[PDB]
């Protein structure tokens, strides 16, 4: 959300990420969510985000908080003609 | 398609934003006038036939 009434994050992702404090980051979390923000709580745990055909991994950082998950998982594969 | 789509129109969506208009006669989504609830082409038919009240052909 663009507004102070937010933030937004999918409950089905926030819950799994909160359970993933005891993950130890050996495992990985798949989501079909590209609309959900990144909280700092997502840091460290790689997320496999569904671009349309596959789940592409992203490693969260302090620097990619504030943004969405889809910004790190492109939809349209293009190679300079 | 269009029968399944006309079904899926009428049952309530997951979220209310997913609403959209369709002419009950022929469920085309485009150019459906919510005041009549008809699509433009069916509207033209019935308006010729005089089966719509108060509407006639606009000269000016």
């Amino acid at each position: 959300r663009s507004l102070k009434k937010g933030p937004f994050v999918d409950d089905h992702l926030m819950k799994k990420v909160e359970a993933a404090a005891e993950s130890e980051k050996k495992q990985v979390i798949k989501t079909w969510s590209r609309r959900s923000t990144i909280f700092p709580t997502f840091v460290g745990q790689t997320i496999a985000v569904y671009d349309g055909r596959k789940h592409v991994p992203v490693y969260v950082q302090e620097d990619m908080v504030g943004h969405k998950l889809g910004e790190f998982a492109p939809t349209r594969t293009y190679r300079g003609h | 398609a269009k029968k399944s789509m006309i079904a899926k129109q009428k049952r309530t969506p997951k979220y209310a934003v997913q609403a959209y208009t369709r002419c009950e006669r022929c469920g085309r989504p485009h150019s459906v006038i919510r005041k009549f609830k008809l699509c433009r082409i069916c509207f033209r038919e019935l308006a010729y036939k005089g089966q719509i009240p108060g509407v006639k052909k606009a000269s000016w």
């Binding site: - | 006038i33 033209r44 509407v55 052909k57 000016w60």
Partner: protein
């Protein structure tokens, strides 16, 4: 101190229905106004004449309303009854 608003799509029906009301209302109580015409609020629906293509060739459909307004100036129960009994040529709308 009571008012009728008649609105429809057909000015001949509407005028004559108003004249009916006014004559009956004068019979049941003498002091009544005449009917007063209001503006014809209307809607011009503009439609593609063709099916597939031809955004440039169209057909236009005007839905007009005609409407008159009446004010009763000395009611009686006779007047109220004459208007409570009376049903008009449909296609119109009476409002009190």
């Amino acid at each position: 101190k009571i008012r009728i608003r008649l609105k429809a799509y057909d000015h001949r029906i509407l005028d004559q229905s108003a004249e009916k009301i006014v004559e009956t209302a004068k019979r049941s109580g003498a002091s009544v106004s005449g009917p007063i015409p209001l503006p014809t609020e209307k809607s011009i629906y503009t439609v593609l004449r063709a099916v597939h293509k031809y955004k440039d060739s169209r057909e236009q459909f005007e839905m007009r309303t005609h409407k008159r307004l009446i004010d009763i100036v000395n009611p009686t129960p006779q007047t109220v009854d004459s208007l409570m009994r009376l049903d008009l040529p449909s296609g119109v709308d009476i409002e009190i």
